Amino acid sequence: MEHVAFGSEDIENTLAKMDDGQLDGLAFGAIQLDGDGNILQYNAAQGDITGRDPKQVIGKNFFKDVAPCTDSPEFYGKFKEGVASGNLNTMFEYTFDYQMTPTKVKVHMKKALSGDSYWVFVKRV
Ligand SMILES: *C(=O)/C=C/c1ccc(O)cc1
């Protein structure tokens, strides 16, 4: 277990050092996306919340394939604007309901430090 708090201001600095194994020790869900929304990293805590098997979703498109309920101005729209503007830091509540029991979460999206990557952080509410 990696001690990093959800919403920490310098979270992107902290997570740049972690490899996939250590991401799996976080207390919250973490997804790393490229600028097109393809999944690069998906941790164990996220799979505990959504039921997905982390290794099976890496490489899939989050908005088109895995999470169609986020294909909306309120989620996807915010991501696409942040990728265009090159800056992103927003937190909101959302409900995940595709092929799963409707689950309410807090979502934190933030630009990664390295190049064209973006974090999606999730915890239950
Ligand atoms: C809506 O379709 C949400 C689905 C979803 C959210 C987060 C994930 O990791 C997987 C599925």
Obtained via which technique?
Answer: X-ray
At 53, list the tokens. 């098997």
DSSP-assigned letter for residue 30: E
Structural domains in the chain plus CATH codes: 1-125 (3.30.450.20)
Provide the H-helix boundaries in 24-89. Answer: 44-50, 54-57, 76-85
What type of residue is 88? Answer: L
> CA-to-CA distance for 117 and 83, rounded, in angstroms?
9
Q: What is the resolution in angstroms?
A: 1.6
According to the 3-state scheme, what is the secondary structure of 76-104? HHHHHHHHHHCCCEEEEEEEECCCCCCEE
CB-based pocket (< 6 A), ligand 1? 46, 50, 52, 66-70, 96, 98
> CA-to-CA distance for 50 and 33, rounded, in angstroms?
17
What type of residue is 3? Answer: H
The phi, psi pair for 88, rounded to 5°, reads -155, 125
Contact 31, 46 (CB under 8 A): yes
Q: Which of 38, 43, 60, 70 best tests ligand 1's pocket when mutated (most atoms within 8 Å of CB)?
A: 70
Q: Specify which residues 29 forms β-bridges with.
A: 122
